[PDB]
Amino acid sequence: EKGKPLMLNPRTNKGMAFTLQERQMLGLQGLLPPKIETQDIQALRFHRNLKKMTSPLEKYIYIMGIQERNEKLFYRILQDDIESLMPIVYTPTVGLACSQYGHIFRRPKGLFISISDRGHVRSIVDNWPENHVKAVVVTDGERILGLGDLGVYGMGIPVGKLCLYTACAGIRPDRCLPVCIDVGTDNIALLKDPFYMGLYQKRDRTQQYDDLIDEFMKAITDRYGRNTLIQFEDFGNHNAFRFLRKYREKYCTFNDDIQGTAAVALAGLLAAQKVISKPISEHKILFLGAGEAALGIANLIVMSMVENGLSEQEAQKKIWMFDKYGLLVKGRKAKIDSYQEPFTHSAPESIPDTFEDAVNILKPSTIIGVAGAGRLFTPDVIRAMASINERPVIFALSNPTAQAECTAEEAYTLTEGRCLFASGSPFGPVKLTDGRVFTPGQGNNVYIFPGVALAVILCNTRHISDSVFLEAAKALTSQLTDEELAQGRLYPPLANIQEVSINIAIKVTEYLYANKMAFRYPEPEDKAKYVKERTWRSEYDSLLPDVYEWP
Amino acid sequence: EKGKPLMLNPRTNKGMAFTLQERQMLGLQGLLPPKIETQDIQALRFHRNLKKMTSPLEKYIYIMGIQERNEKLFYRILQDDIESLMPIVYTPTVGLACSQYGHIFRRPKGLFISISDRGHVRSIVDNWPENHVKAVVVTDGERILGLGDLGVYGMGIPVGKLCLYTACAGIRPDRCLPVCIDVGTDNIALLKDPFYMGLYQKRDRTQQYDDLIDEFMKAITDRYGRNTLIQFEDFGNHNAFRFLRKYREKYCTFNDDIQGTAAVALAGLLAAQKVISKPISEHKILFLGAGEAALGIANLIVMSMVENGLSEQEAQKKIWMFDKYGLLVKGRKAKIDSYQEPFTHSAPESIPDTFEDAVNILKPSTIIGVAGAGRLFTPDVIRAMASINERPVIFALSNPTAQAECTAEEAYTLTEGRCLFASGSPFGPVKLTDGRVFTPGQGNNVYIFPGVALAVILCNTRHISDSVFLEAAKALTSQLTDEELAQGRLYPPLANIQEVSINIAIKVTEYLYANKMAFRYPEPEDKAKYVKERTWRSEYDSLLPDVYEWP
Amino acid sequence: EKGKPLMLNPRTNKGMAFTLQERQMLGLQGLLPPKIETQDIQALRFHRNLKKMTSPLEKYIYIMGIQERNEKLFYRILQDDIESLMPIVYTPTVGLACSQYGHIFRRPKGLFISISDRGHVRSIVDNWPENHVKAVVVTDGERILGLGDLGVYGMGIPVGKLCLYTACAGIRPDRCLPVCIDVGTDNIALLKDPFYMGLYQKRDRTQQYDDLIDEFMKAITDRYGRNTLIQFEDFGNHNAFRFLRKYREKYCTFNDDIQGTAAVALAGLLAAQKVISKPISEHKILFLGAGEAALGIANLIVMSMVENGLSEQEAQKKIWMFDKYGLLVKGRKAKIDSYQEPFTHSAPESIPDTFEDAVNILKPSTIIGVAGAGRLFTPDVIRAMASINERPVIFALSNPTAQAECTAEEAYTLTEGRCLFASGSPFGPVKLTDGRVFTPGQGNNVYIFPGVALAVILCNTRHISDSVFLEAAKALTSQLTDEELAQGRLYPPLANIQEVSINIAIKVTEYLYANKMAFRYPEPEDKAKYVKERTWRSEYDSLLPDVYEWP
Ligand SMILES: NC(=O)c1ccc[n+]([C@@H]2O[C@H](COP(=O)([O-])OP(=O)(O)OC[C@H]3O[C@@H](n4cnc5c(N)ncnc54)[C@H](O)[C@@H]3O)[C@@H](O)[C@H]2O)c1
Ligand SMILES: NC(=O)c1ccc[n+]([C@@H]2O[C@H](COP(=O)([O-])OP(=O)(O)OC[C@H]3O[C@@H](n4cnc5c(N)ncnc54)[C@H](O)[C@@H]3O)[C@@H](O)[C@H]2O)c1
Ligand SMILES: NC(=O)c1ccc[n+]([C@@H]2O[C@H](COP(=O)([O-])OP(=O)(O)OC[C@H]3O[C@@H](n4cnc5c(N)ncnc54)[C@H](O)[C@@H]3O)[C@@H](O)[C@H]2O)c1
Ligand SMILES: NC(=O)c1ccc[n+]([C@@H]2O[C@H](COP(=O)([O-])OP(=O)(O)OC[C@H]3O[C@@H](n4cnc5c(N)ncnc54)[C@H](O)[C@@H]3O)[C@@H](O)[C@H]2O)c1
Ligand SMILES: NC(=O)c1ccc[n+]([C@@H]2O[C@H](COP(=O)([O-])OP(=O)(O)OC[C@H]3O[C@@H](n4cnc5c(N)ncnc54)[C@H](O)[C@@H]3O)[C@@H](O)[C@H]2O)c1
Ligand SMILES: NC(=O)c1ccc[n+]([C@@H]2O[C@H](COP(=O)([O-])OP(=O)(O)OC[C@H]3O[C@@H](n4cnc5c(N)ncnc54)[C@H](O)[C@@H]3O)[C@@H](O)[C@H]2O)c1
Ligand SMILES: O=C(O)c1cc(Cc2ccc(O)c(C(=O)O)c2)ccc1O
Numbered sequence A, B, C: 001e002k003g004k005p006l007m008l009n010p011r012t013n014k015g016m017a018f019t020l021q022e023r024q025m026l027g028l029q030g031l032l033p034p035k036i037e038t039q040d041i042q043a044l045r046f047h048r049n050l051k052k053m054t055s056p057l058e059k060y061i062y063i064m065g066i067q068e069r070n071e072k073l074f075y076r077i078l079q080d081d082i083e084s085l086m087p088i089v090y091t092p093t094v095g096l097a098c099s100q101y102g103h104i105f106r107r108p109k110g111l112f113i114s115i116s117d118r119g120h121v122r123s124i125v126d127n128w129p130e131n132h133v134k135a136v137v138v139t140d141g142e143r144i145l146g147l148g149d150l151g152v153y154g155m156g157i158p159v160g161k162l163c164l165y166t167a168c169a170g171i172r173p174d175r176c177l178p179v180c181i182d183v184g185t186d187n188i189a190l191l192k193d194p195f196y197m198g199l200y201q202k203r204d205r206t207q208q209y210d211d212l213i214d215e216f217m218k219a220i221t222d223r224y225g226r227n228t229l230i231q232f233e234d235f236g237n238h239n240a241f242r243f244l245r246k247y248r249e250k251y252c253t254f255n256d257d258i259q260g261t262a263a264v265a266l267a268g269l270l271a272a273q274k275v276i277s278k279p280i281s282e283h284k285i286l287f288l289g290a291g292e293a294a295l296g297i298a299n300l301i302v303m304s305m306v307e308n309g310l311s312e313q314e315a316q317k318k319i320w321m322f323d324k325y326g327l328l329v330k331g332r333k334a335k336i337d338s339y340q341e342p343f344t345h346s347a348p349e350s351i352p353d354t355f356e357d358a359v360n361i362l363k364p365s366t367i368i369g370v371a372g373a374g375r376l377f378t379p380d381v382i383r384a385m386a387s388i389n390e391r392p393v394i395f396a397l398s399n400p401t402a403q404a405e406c407t408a409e410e411a412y413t414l415t416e417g418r419c420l421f422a423s424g425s426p427f428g429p430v431k432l433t434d435g436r437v438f439t440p441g442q443g444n445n446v447y448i449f450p451g452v453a454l455a456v457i458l459c460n461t462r463h464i465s466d467s468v469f470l471e472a473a474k475a476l477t478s479q480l481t482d483e484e485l486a487q488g489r490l491y492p493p494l495a496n497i498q499e500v501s502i503n504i505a506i507k508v509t510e511y512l513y514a515n516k517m518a519f520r521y522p523e524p525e526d527k528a529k530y531v532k533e534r535t536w537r538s539e540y541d542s543l544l545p546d547v548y549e550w551p
């Protein structure tokens, strides 16, 4: 590359970080303003401009423009101030941007695969320029978090997600590929407007869609190898669950909604058992719902109990999921699926028909809001649990705040501060009237998915087992220091997520080599140095050709 | 070109206007959303988005983003709604954008030539990709209209100007080259901030700057030929005037501030003499100032009088410029330069020291606000002139409105509507209490410079004489219809400027061939068809390779 | 790629195999003659042209021109008729071409690394376009086979060699890299002429040369990985031997002169023991020389004896190398190096000072001409051995024919046809007066090095052990059929070398996985299908973009 295409390419574009000698040798002289700036000046300038803006959507437009222009400076900006720019880059600002502005990308991002393109997906994959990609994020747009069906406009969900992949873990930006598979949109408003950008049919739910998914995965693994990591982001619950079950064995697929959330919740529980004297195996758990997400969380919990030596049956006896119809129990009138069969225990005497009565009779030590039907955790049940348990553990995993089962402020104020609270939604620190301000921990998947993805990429793992996420949860819990536990935090601070992700990767990497699930050989003697070398560094590299004189 | 670089190039980028067969043959399949859109849908979408925005600066950012992304659609948007988007694209929104946001261009535009690059300007010119350029706009940034010195941030002034070159005249976008020559900035604020993007020295006024201008013009004419049209935009008054005088003979240079404004004012005067019974040669003129701009206007006026057969001396006797010190008169104590010597007439008896008394004694038929010292046209002098003349002609050429000598509303209301008013600043229609709403004509250079530039480009003219602008003014006046003259308008509507510009070009082209100043041979038999063929059309052209089967 | 660069690139160039639709879609229409030809017509045409030529050097020029023009057709031509074109492409015609015509390549081939470029070898390696290379052949030019020192003109030796890598094994042409390291030339004639193309200094033998080799290997392994296969071709005996010893452990290096020749000779010996009733371990061996080449051959022989269960000491007792001074024996006046110490046996009673007397007393069953001092195998010693042994085994590994120790015709005629003869030099079939025409087997490294290289490339082997070549020799011997052994052939025919090489690779691959020396995981269940899939196929692949119509 030379001349103008050097700046036009975001991978190699330096803005004004092009030194004078670089400008003169590479033919960039005269096409740039006379000033020469280090990357620090560039980042400071864009941080000032970002501080000027006041709305998260405007910040999103600005930061994505920076990404389309210069990627290395964009990632330095993102890594430099990551706690404040993470909501802008991934969630929930991406949903709002996709809904209101639709498609904003002034540059080709990822691939658009349609059901009209069935039978020829391999050519579409061949059209993608990058020869080696390691991570692929696939979206259907059917279930955008909090916005329902956006159709083809959900392509911002993978791209933003991939930014985190590079901002936290260190995966190279050119090894990532965001893919949007659109089979139509289900909402009327998108079907009606003339400026919708995609198929105008209603969403296709026939065998054609399943065959399209099969063909796409086969084509991507044919071009990029069997060990390419493919992640299904924001599919429908039915589609995502079924596709994870179908492709988990064949391909290197892990789903963040099902598996990452279980890892984050289990990490919170391990932090709680580090704070509370009693262990996890001693105390029983009550779930708000019983679905494959809830079954995944309970499976991680029972695995964590088993690894400590306690028997699988005794560990399963602890969890008592509660369905929509009622408490999950043997002989119940309501149907019981095979997956939720293991947590089907003996009948309680009352057989309560309400959740509050269920807490009253069962007297659980931990409560988990996995059902997400809405604002289910009433103050009455919270007070009942606080009476039952000395230090109750309350989890409200659903987001946003309105959809959450409980509010951190109410949960902390209603009790005397004894409860341990962790929620998916972000909440500000809560200060009681007497004092003792409490900061509710926030558990989001950004803790887990980047580090696990980096470890799987580096280890050339072909099958992502369910125990990998247990190891990741243990690593995430071990990240916490003693003083953080004393403060009452259950998760490491998001201000220094990058190192956390790196550490997580290390642990997973060691596990992947201990259990013969990693196919990158020779096995490194030290995993930490190997992963720290493999990571991407967002620092400009000189393009000056080496000039010397022969003797 | 094939694949991704086809979209990355704004010249060849089509957005979703890429037909399905084009996407499949050229390898764009899968990189675009599934929808295929004609250019009309694209323009409608962007017009709706533009209507959503409410501030002219936001509109400027949006439209320039469109230009950086897809140029043909940008020019269709600009030509489609040109009256409302012309203030956004060129003036005064470009000044505000350059002042507040500095440099916003996410793509290389034009060239940046600095005084530190002296001695090597030819290499900088060689760095520019386009092999053939016909028009060059050079800015120094010293005098941005209404904003003083912006230093290197004035580069938005050429680029926006060049948009008009393509939006009105039809000059090809790739034949244009915006050049910013920065020799430092004079204002302290730009020198002080760390994020200024250019030289941190104070503006250089020595022989080095003149030699840099000489070298730049020599280098540009060496690479692109002697007939390359070079225009000095927004230099300092001293620098622009001196450089026009120096390079007018050697190179194909015309300055819009000096020569285009004279053409527009003379066109307004010709429209006035079409409205008013009396001819131009019969009535005398009084100027608010006497400078090379005022001398250029008066020179155009005397040329127009001469071409009608009236002697040069008699024509010169009519104009009576008024200096800052006082009325320009022979034997005056104040200095008289050689250029303003011809309009130095016999002493009036009063020798008035104030402008109002000057109007009272001289009793001019026409008044022209070329001095622009500020709000000089008092209501008293306006009433005095309206008493003197049955239908006074009042010109307030200075802009913005605050800097204008008079307000169109006040000028029309104060008189009974008899006056003919034309101003550089845009004014809304003025409706009197009794009735008879009057729309003051607005005279801006966008009438003249695009068509003249197109004619000069097509005719391969090496020297732009001063009579070319007289011919252009006559053409612009002839554009007006009888009903428009009856309404009181002095200029053609800006809604249909494009055709106006085309017509202007035709006339100039004919003149350039009648006076042996055009070097494009063979001379076309009909100039209209020649120019209408040569113009650029902002319509997508199919990239499909021709596929046929041999017999 | 599109248009003219598609033909200019030999990798993607098809000549007239471009179908009409390919020409029309890819923009090649009109740049090619109207005819459309399959690859068969192209190969037939070039075979006819090749038959017209009469001198091997002219054939070499023609075939290398074809390679520079279209590589896939060149490799189809080479594979189609490989027995006759192998002498043209690699040996000995490459030496003659390099000597007489110097550098003939009209296209950049490989890299030229000079000692003046020391300290900056990494930049030179970075200049090479191909991102992934698997095989590297490095030449110094000091010892070209039969032509001494050619300096920088020896670059034809790697390139031609790499052709075999693709013609026999199936290694992709773009994964190969020929490198010529020139530290000067030692011969006066090249130093004297003005048109020599390289350094005009005498060959550098100081520490600078060793440091240059170290730096080059480090730079190549840094860019292309630790498992890149690097082969030292035609270095000096001292330099090649020392560099193999030094870099065998660190890098994936195998030397054909030392290790491949041992494998070929051992394969001949195994074919002999399949023809002769007695086993290898039963009969003793006498060598003409004792050097690291002879020690390598004897090491392969003792390994082959050991793998059959016979003890290492007993196996070593069999080989009796004969030095230049005299028979290698304990207590000898002449110096004995550490490497040749194991084959230092008890003193014979005569202690013969001549080779004929050595054969007379020792009465060896096998004789091997590894010394290559010249025409050493006198008819007297041949008759003596034929009297000693019922079916003597005579090996003349040195080439060319004049340098050979014996002539196949003389060896076969002098005995009654009982002897088994294998020589490096090619010899025509020898027909005795009574009858029974005998075809002497020819043992050249082209049997071994391509298949071993392919197996090492596919298995990602980091260290090439000495037992790999023993396994390769066993595979090569097992290639022979029973009827071929009955005919008296010791090596498979060269007409079908490709499949032979493939089979060799398979065996080596299995060995590399059986001994945990292969780092490509997951380990394939069947090695044969894996290697047969991985090989390069010299068949044109359609460049037509997939064109379909959406429903
Ligand atoms: N200027 C460049 O862009 C540049 C320079 C050097 C190397 N590379 C890349 O290094 C690769 C060589 O692989 P290796 O020797 O490191 O294998 P490795 O053994 O070190 O790693 C094993 C796997 O992990 C992948 N991987 C390693 N680091 C990664 C990262 N930061 N992000 C995402 N994936 C990562 C690798 O692609 C590889 O497949 C080349 O394919 C090449 O693409 C690129
Ligand atoms: N990306 C994330 O942050 C993430 C991840 C996992 C789960 N979740 C949460 O899980 C929920 C959806 O996941 P899912 O797999 O469980 O859905 P699902 O369709 O598989 O099943 C929902 C379960 O909730 C139970 N339930 C529903 N309403 C109930 C009610 N009013 N009272 C008692 N039980 C009720 C149902 O019995 C059912 O078993 C959402 O709230 C979602 O916020 C979020
Ligand atoms: N796909 C394309 O981009 C394309 C196709 C055809 C021709 N062209 C251009 O046409 C030019 C051939 O010149 P010609 O035969 O028309 O000479 P001409 O006699 O018709 O015109 C005389 C001069 O006017 C210039 N000119 C003509 N039209 C112009 C326009 N719309 N905008 C700006 N300048 C214009 C020309 O460059 C020429 O120098 C080529 O240099 C080539 O750059 C471009
Ligand atoms: N781009 C445009 O629209 C354009 C073009 C031409 C001229 N102008 C107007 O011309 C003016 C500057 O051009 P210029 O070449 O004449 O400047 P200049 O420096 O060459 O001379 C200014 C003239 O104005 C006279 N003058 C100044 N103040 C006066 C006062 N209070 N009373 C009477 N006379 C006074 C002076 O005698 C002097 O001759 C600006 O108002 C500018 O708006 C604008
Ligand atoms: N159109 C093309 O040029 C094209 C198409 C597909 C794949 N490829 C190549 O396939 C490679 C993917 O490697 P893989 O999935 O086959 O790994 P693999 O597990 O099948 O093989 C292991 C190693 O052997 C190498 N190798 C395989 N076949 C080879 C051959 N015929 N010649 C020389 N070396 C060979 C590979 O580079 C790899 O490093 C890509 O790097 C890419 O360069 C090229
Ligand atoms: N590329 C090939 O085909 C290939 C491969 C290996 C060996 N060779 C042959 O080996 C020879 C060189 O290899 P090297 O490593 O053995 O050289 P070397 O320098 O390492 O040693 C040569 C050996 O030959 C012995 N010798 C020399 N002259 C002798 C004589 N007149 N009588 C008895 N013994 C004598 C010497 O004692 C010495 O040990 C060449 O003939 C060469 O053709 C060829
Ligand atoms: O490399 C650099 O630092 C660099 C920075 C800028 C400033 C800029 C960029 C994007 C924007 O959206 C806005 C804005 O709109 O304020 C401003 C321009 C050119 C550059 O080369």
Ligand SMILES: O=C(O)c1cc(Cc2ccc(O)c(C(=O)O)c2)ccc1O
Pocket: A101, A103, A104, A105, A106, B014, B015, B016, B017, B042, B045, B049, B062, B065
């Ligand atoms: O070609 C097209 O029509 C096309 C249009 C869009 C929409 C768009 C572009 C720029 C914007 O700034 C905004 C916004 O910010 O609202 C939106 C995106 C991709 C396309 O390919």
Ligand SMILES: O=C(O)c1cc(Cc2ccc(O)c(C(=O)O)c2)ccc1O
Pocket: C014, C015, C016, C017, C042, C049, C062, C065
């Ligand atoms: O692709 C093809 O078949 C093809 C073949 C030829 C013939 C040819 C090539 C090389 C030569 O050296 C000689 C000669 O010298 O006789 C002749 C020319 C153009 C082609 O496109």
